[PDB]
Amino acid sequence: DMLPRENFRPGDRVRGVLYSVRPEARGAQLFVTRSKPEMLIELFRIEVPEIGEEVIEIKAAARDPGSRAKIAVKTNDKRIDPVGACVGMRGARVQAVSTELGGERIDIVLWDDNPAQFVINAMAPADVASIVVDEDKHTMDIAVEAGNLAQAIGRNGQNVRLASQ
């Protein structure tokens, strides 16, 4: 349930969503898993003041935990910077929120009315010349230059997986 590389030590606090109490010998004990996207989602909910008041809505939160993450959010018709409000001063929300995950590489991303734009805005940070998504079998096909492709793919397809997810 923990990170692969991030090793905890005593004196370090950890916040997580607990999900099970399995009855062991001589009574049960609490168990958590501080690696889900629920953890970063609630962390940004406790972080952003516009998240509670419905000025902006969190459309999708996608995380490869500890490694790399991309969440797409939009403003609920206020002409408001969702990345600027969910970022704080100089990243001072999300770079603090990444400290909740233990070093997450998180990207707040834009989203628009039509789903096509959302998918095109979920390919950041990478430009997209054209996108041919299949209307039948959910198989959006994005096409651009090699330079953007590398950034649109990432290490083990993180960006692709994130966007796809």
């Binding site: 509670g52 008041e53 419905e54 000025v55 809505e57 609920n76 018709d77 206020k78 002409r79």
Partner: protein, 225 residues
């Protein structure tokens, strides 16, 4: 979807007296019978249809609709409409800054919820009689005000309104935030704040009901889709 004949039967075509009109409603007016303004059903119907379509579309993307009507004649009906399509509503007085000042009103909602829980799920009873009474009163107050919107969570993605002049505060709020507005707008009302104006009789009960029902149906359809 909704026919012209039905509308006529309801009393949509009737408007307010000529001295109380707004000249911004001059396009939607047809004529004046017995010194009372008649709304043009030829211009109304298509607009209404369009509005309905829009609503349906909104529903389809899991949009939150808010039904506003604080006339007190059609308070019962609007609530019913809301509940049929399991959507939210404000059938009693609109709290000034319900949407613009959501974050404060979110606290109120929470409080109300807590009160409800105390009333129902706790089953504790054993409370000082005056205090208990006070609590009950508070609960009643909350229910009346924020009963429909308690499960709304955030802000709505569209706003259906039964009277534009009466609910101008709501409309204004929706404009400031940019929420789409779907107002029923009689001849006395102002259509400028409204996005999807519906020229029709706000006052008559049957007409109001008709307006509600179709909308509800469309929302349901959207949900189904």
């Amino acid at each position: 979807t909704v026919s012209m004949r039905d509308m006529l039967k309801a009393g949509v075509h009737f408007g307010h007296q000529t001295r109380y009109w707004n000249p911004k409603m001059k396009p939607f007016i047809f004529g004046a019978r017995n010194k009372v303004h008649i709304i043009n059903l030829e211009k109304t119907v298509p607009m209404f249809n369009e509005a309905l379509a829009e609503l349906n579309k909104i529903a389809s993307r899991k949009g939150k609709i808010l039904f506003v009507g604080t006339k007190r004649a059609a308070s019962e009906a609007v609530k019913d409409a809301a509940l049929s399509c399991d959507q939210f509503f404000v059938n009693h007085r609109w709290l000034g800054g319900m949407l613009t000042n959501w974050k404060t009103v979110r606290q109120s909602i929470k409080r109300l919820k807590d009160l409800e829980t105390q009333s129902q799920d706790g089953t504790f009873d054993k409370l000082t009689k005056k205090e208990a009474l006070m609590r009950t009163r508070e609960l009643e107050k909350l229910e009346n005000s924020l009963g429909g919107i308690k499960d709304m969570g955030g802000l709505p993605d569209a706003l259906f309104v039964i009277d534009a002049d009466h609910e101008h505060i709501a409309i204004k709020e929706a404009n400031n935030l940019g929420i789409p507005v779907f107002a029923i707008v009689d001849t006395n009302s102002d259509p400028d704040g409204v996005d999807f104006v519906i020229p029709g009789n706000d006052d008559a009960i049957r007409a109001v009901t008709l307006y509600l029902g179709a909308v509800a149906a469309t929302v349901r359809e959207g949900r189904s889709q």
